[PDB]
Specification:
This is Bacterial SCP orthologue domain-containing protein. It is built from three helices and four strands; from the N terminus they run H-H-E-E-E-H-E. It is an alpha+beta fold and about 120 residues long. It is globular, with a radius of gyration of 13 Å.
Length: about 120
């Protein structure tokens, strides 16, 4: 929603430059939850599980726990979700399990931010 864009703006300065003031746990938690829930909305399904510990776990992409898992930290997730980082350039920071985990790439960025 409009609340997702508000939550991303509150952490955008820190995403562009980490030397800037780090957001509070509450700000980081909402920006992670709302961007992951946006991914689950634009691509409904339960083929892939996106885990961003300790803030969220969402199920997405068409087809118990899904057989495909994408696991990453809050900062990497928000860089991917805003398009500041490509999942190809992400490396070992994004851990993937299953044959279709990499399909999340077709649905990123979920919120385009100014670079």
């Amino acid at each position: 929603p409009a609340k997702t864009l508000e939550a991303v703006s509150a952490v955008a300065d820190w995403l562009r430059d980490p030397q800037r003031e780090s957001p509070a746990r509450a700000q980081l938690a909402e920006a992670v939850r709302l961007t992951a829930r946006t991914l689950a909305a634009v691509a409904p399904g339960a083929s892939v599980e996106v885990r961003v510990p300790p803030f969220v776990a969402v199920q997405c992409i068409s087809g118990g726990t899904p057989p495909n898992v994408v696991e990453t930290d809050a900062r990497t997730w928000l860089l991917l979700a805003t398009g500041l980082l490509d999942i190809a350039d992400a490396g070992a920071s994004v851990q993937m399990s299953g044959s279709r985990a990499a399909e999340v790439a077709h649905w990123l960025p979920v919120v385009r931010i100014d670079p």
